Amino acid sequence: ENPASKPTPVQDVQGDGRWMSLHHRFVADSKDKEPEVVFIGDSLVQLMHQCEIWRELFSPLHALNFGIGGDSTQHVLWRLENGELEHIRPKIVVVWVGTNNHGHTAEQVTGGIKAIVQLVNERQPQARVVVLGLLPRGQHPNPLREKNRRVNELVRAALAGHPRAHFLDADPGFVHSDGTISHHDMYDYAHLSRLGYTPVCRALHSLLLRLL
Amino acid sequence: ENPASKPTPVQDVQGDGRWMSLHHRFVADSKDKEPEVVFIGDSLVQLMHQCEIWRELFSPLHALNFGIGGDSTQHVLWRLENGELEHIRPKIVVVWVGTNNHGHTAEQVTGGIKAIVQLVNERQPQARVVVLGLLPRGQHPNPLREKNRRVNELVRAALAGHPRAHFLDADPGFVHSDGTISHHDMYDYAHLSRLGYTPVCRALHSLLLRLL
C-alpha cells in the first residue's frame, strides 16, 4: 500500500483528543450547513480562517474550512470518508495537503493527492476539485523544496487530463534570487503570515470566481 | 537528569532546518536590538506576534518575541543558553512553555520551568521574570488539563519565594461549567484565536506595566 493513500485517523498520543474533536466539529458543520465551497487540508488551510481575511474573500462564497494543523494526505482522505462530505453538495472542493508527508517519497505523496481527488469525484461527483501546489519551505535551499516541487510537477501532469480537476500554483515567488524565503512571508519558513496569505488567497479567489 | 531541564536543540528530522533558522534569527535580533522585554516560549508566545495585536499592547514596550511552535522547556533552556540572551539587558523576560512536554510528569515540567528562571537569573540578573500558567486544552475534561493545572500549582509555589519572579495565571476561565472549551477561544482546543488572545494579553500587559 502507499501509506499516503491508506486512510487513517491521527492517533492521539498526547491525551486531549483534539484531532477527533476537530473532525466531529466539521462533521456537524457538514450535517447542519450548506456550503458551496469546502476547504480541506493542513494548517495552511486551517490558519487562513483566522490569520488571513477569509471573511472578505471567502465567506461570501459559502465556504467551510476543514483544515487541521499537521495533517498528511492519508489523514485528509480518512476525514473525507468518515463524515465530512456527508449531507452536503458543494460546487467546489479545495484541497491543500502533502507538505507534512514526512518519510513519504514525492511519488507517494502524489498518490495520496490522487486518492483524495478520486474520493471527492466518487462521493461528490458534481463538485469541481481544486488542488493547490505545495509551497516552498525552509529559509535556504533544502530537500523539501525539491520534494514539494516534484509533487507539484507530478500532480499537475496527473490533473491535466481531468475536465473538472484544477491544479493551481498559488506561489507568487516566495523563493528569492538569493535562494532565501523571507520571514515576512513565512514567519517560520513554512507557515504564512498575513502578508504571505494575501497573494495566495487572491490567486485562489480568482480561480474560484471563474469556476463558480 | 530531568529531561525537561536538560538543554537540547530540536533535532531536524524533516530536512529544512527551520528550527535552527528561527534560533539564528533571534540571536541576530538580540545582537542588533535593545529590547526591554523578551518573550520566549512555544507557539502561544510565537503566534501572539501575528494572531493577536502585539503592535498595540506590546510593541510600545520594546519587546522581542522568541516563540517557536512545538518547543518544550528543554528547547527554550537551550535557546537561552546558546545566544538569545547575548548582547541585551532586558528589564523583563516573559516565559511561556511546558504544555508541549509530552511524556514528562508535571513535576518534571516544573523542574524545566525552574531551570529556565535560574538561567535567566544568572545570565540576566537585573531582569524580572514572568512565568505564565499553562492554559487548559482539549474540548472536554482530559489528563492534560490536570497535568497543566498541577504544573501551575507547583510553579506558583516555587515562585512564591522569589522577589523578582512572578507567576501570572492569564486564564480568564476558558473551561466552562459544562466542562468544555469553546472553539471561539481556541480554534483547535489548544491554540488561541484572536478572541482568546485578547484577555490573555491584557492580563499580561497589566502585569508588565506595574512592573515596568
Calculate how close chain B gets to A194, using CA atoms only, in Å: 8
Is residue B23 classed as helix, strand or coil in its secondary structure?
helix
Strand A92-96 with A128-132, pairing: parallel
**Torsion region of B129: left, alpha or beta (phi above 0 gives left; psi -120 to 50 gives alpha):** beta
All structural domains of chain B, each given as residue ranges with its CATH number in brackets, are 1-212 (3.40.50.1110)
Is residue B63 classed as helix, strand or coil in its secondary structure?
strand
d(Cα A59, Cα A71) in Å, to the nearest integer?
23
d(Cα B134, Cα B131) in Å, to the nearest integer?
9
Cα dihedral B102→B192→B52→A190 (10° resolution): 60
Angle among Cα B52, B54, B57 to the nearest 5 degrees reads: 115
d(Cα B107, Cα B124) in Å, to the nearest integer?
25
Q: What does residue B132 show for φ and ψ, rounded to 5 degrees?
A: -85, 140
Number of neighbours of residue B128 by Cβ within 10 angstroms: 21
Alpha helices in B94-193 (DSSP H): 106-123, 143-160
d(Cα B118, Cα B75) in Å, to the nearest integer?
15
d(Cα A39, Cα A47) in Å, to the nearest integer?
11
**Torsion region of A168: left, alpha or beta (phi above 0 gives left; psi -120 to 50 gives alpha):** beta
Residue holding cell 492534560? Answer: B144
Q: Which three cell numbers stand for residue B147?
A: 497535568
**Could you tell me how far CA A178 lies from the centroid of its own chain?**
28
Question: Which residues of chain B have a CB within 8 Å of the CB of A22?
Answer: 188-189
d(Cα A123, Cα A176) in Å, to the nearest integer?
41
- How many Cα atoms within 13 Å fall on the side-chain side of residue B71? 34
Residue holding cell 520534494? Answer: A147
Angle among Cα B100, B104, B107 to the nearest 5 degrees reads: 110
Would you give the DSSP letter of residue A84? Answer: I
Q: Which three cell numbers stand for residue B123?
A: 545570565
d(Cα B105, Cα A2) in Å, to the nearest integer?
37
How determined? Answer: X-ray
Mark whether A43 is an active-site residue.
yes
d(Cα B28, Cα B188) in Å, to the nearest integer?
33
Beta bridge partners of B63: B37
Calculate how close chain B gets to A152, using CA atoms only, in Å: 18
Residue A97 host element (H or E): none
Which residues of A have a CB under 8 Å from any CB of B?
A: 13-18, 21-22, 25, 46, 49-51, 68-69, 102, 137-140, 142-145, 183, 187-190, 193-194
Question: Which residues of chain A have a CB within 8 Å of the CB of B49?
Answer: 187
Data resolution in angstroms: 2.3
Q: Which residues fall within 8 angstroms of residue B125, CB to CB, at 6 or more apart?
A: none
